[PDB]
Design a protein around this ligand. Structure first.
Ligand SMILES: O=[N+]([O-])c1ccc(O[C@@H]2O[C@H](CO)[C@@H](O[C@@H]3O[C@H](CO)[C@@H](O[C@@H]4O[C@H](CO)[C@@H](O)[C@H](O)[C@H]4O)[C@H](O)[C@H]3O)[C@H](O)[C@H]2O)cc1
Ligand SMILES: O=[N+]([O-])c1ccc(O[C@@H]2O[C@H](CO)[C@@H](O[C@@H]3O[C@H](CO)[C@@H](O[C@@H]4O[C@H](CO)[C@@H](O)[C@H](O)[C@H]4O)[C@H](O)[C@H]3O)[C@H](O)[C@H]2O)cc1
Ligand SMILES: [Mg+2]
Length: 372
């Protein structure tokens, strides 16, 4: 069943608190409407990212808060998590902050990291909640398009085995799993569709060798990207790609999933998808200037318009930087000084207030204000 129907995805308190800085900015500008729109954003659920082992410490307090909120509100709280820590993570990138490396016992360390997450998701409080979990952004797409990269060659089996273990470890009636499936500009190209479907099925089959009847709900798409759900003005860079918006990516990928016997249900990130025409190349990803908040999280089929889409969601939390633009930073990524990038920008994950200001202003549909 679509686990989003009737459920109330969890508002992440630590994220909402960061937005107080954005509210303060707008109030100082004498801009009460945008201050009020920012308050609306405080009440919009986002995914909590578990991108390292230290962040596992945040999970039980998050669950305790979620249970208290469920008791107070009478809602069916749906905790949304991203698991993002494969060994030799981000294999095609020049650099990765992933803490596990295959040559330093990374496969076994990843299993234990998963095991630590499982322990937190197996408490009496956890049992009271429902979870939606996105598995491993920036992973399996690399096996489709980046097998000429030595690091990807050496990580391919590990990515499949790692995700397989995560799937096999999180089979519970109150957990739905979505394997990350990149975005239309990566895997939507004609020649990438079938091998993508095949690798998702291959990974699920490996999971079933660990836990016999293991399943996933489907796929997560556009995570951390900017692609529109339905484009208003198709971009020139999408020429010869039938997945020129994320709704079309669903429609174009679905038949291949069906053909290989992989579940064809999707959740779609639209947290930074409000404004189009912000990039000159599809591969630009880092802090794209003038990005807007997109369609708010919803299951409404009048918007979603696809039996294959469970929900539009906000996975990457807008305002958390994609990377620093400082040329001298230890983790400097040249992509973060692209012609389309918002500069200056802070370290990946750090608060980028100027960028959130623009996310509010460029939101589409416009944000409805929340007034006290
Ligand atoms: O002219 N053509 O017919 C044609 C055919 C295929 C082409 O190749 C595709 O180009 C895409 C570029 O959008 C690539 O996607 C990027 O991949 C990055 C990680 O590798 C991600 O970071 C980016 O996000 C993501 O956008 C794809 O791998 C690659 O398969 C290109 C042209
Ligand atoms: O789809 N993809 O290809 C892709 C690639 C890279 C991505 O990057 C990740 O984005 C996460 C979300 O911003 C970040 O998590 C934040 O880290 C902060 C550290 O201070 C915490 O404070 C926040 O809380 C916490 O949410 C991660 O660092 C960052 O590595 C994400 C997706
Ligand atoms: Mg490191």
């Amino acid at each position: 069943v679509n686990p989003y129907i009737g459920r109330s995805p969890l508002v992440i308190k630590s994220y909402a608190e960061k937005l107080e800085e954005t509210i303060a900015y707008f109030e100082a500008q004498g801009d009460e409407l945008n201050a009020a729109r920012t308050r609306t954003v405080q009440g919009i659920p986002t995914f909590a990212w578990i991108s390292d082992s230290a962040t596992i410490d945040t999970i039980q307090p998050l669950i305790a808060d979620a249970v208290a909120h469920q008791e107070a509100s009478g809602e069916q709280v749906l905790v949304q998590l991203v698991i993002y820590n494969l060994p030799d993570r981000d294999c095609a990138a020049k650099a990765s902050d992933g803490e596990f490396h295959l040559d330093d016992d990374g496969a076994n360390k990843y299993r234990a990291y998963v095991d630590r997450i499982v322990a937190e998701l197996s408490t009496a409080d956890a049992d009271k909640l429902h979870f939606s979990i996105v598995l491993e952004p920036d992973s399996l797409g690399n096996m489709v398009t980046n097998m000429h990269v030595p690091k990807c060659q050496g990580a391919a089996t590990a990515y499949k085995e790692g995700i397989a273990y995560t799937i096999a470890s999180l089979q519970k009636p109150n957990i739905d799993l979505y394997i990350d499936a990149a975005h239309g500009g990566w895997l939507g190209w004609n020649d990438n569709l079938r091998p993508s479907a095949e690798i998702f099925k291959e990974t699920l089959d490996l999971a079933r060798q660990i836990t016999p009847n293991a399943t996933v709900r489907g796929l997560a798409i556009n995570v951390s990207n900017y692609n529109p759900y339905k484009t208003r003005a198709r971009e020139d860079y999408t020429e010869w790609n039938n997945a020129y918006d994320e709704w079309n990516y669903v429609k174009t990928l679905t038949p291949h999933l069906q053909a290989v016997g992989f579940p064809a249900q999707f959740i779609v990130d639209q947290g930074r998808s409000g404004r189009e025409g912000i990039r000159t190349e599809w591969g630009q990803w880092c802090n794209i200037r003038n990005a807007g908040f997109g369609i708010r999280p919803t299951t409404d089929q009048a918007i979603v318009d696809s039996a294959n889409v469970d929900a539009i969601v906000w996975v990457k939390p807008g305002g958390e930087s994609d990377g620093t633009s400082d040329v001298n930073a230890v983790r400097f990524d040249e992509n973060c000084r692209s012609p389309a990038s918002h500069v200056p920008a802070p370290e990946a994950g750090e608060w980028f207030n100027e960028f959130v200001v623009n996310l509010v202003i460029n939101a589409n549909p416009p944000l409805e204000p929340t007034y006290a």
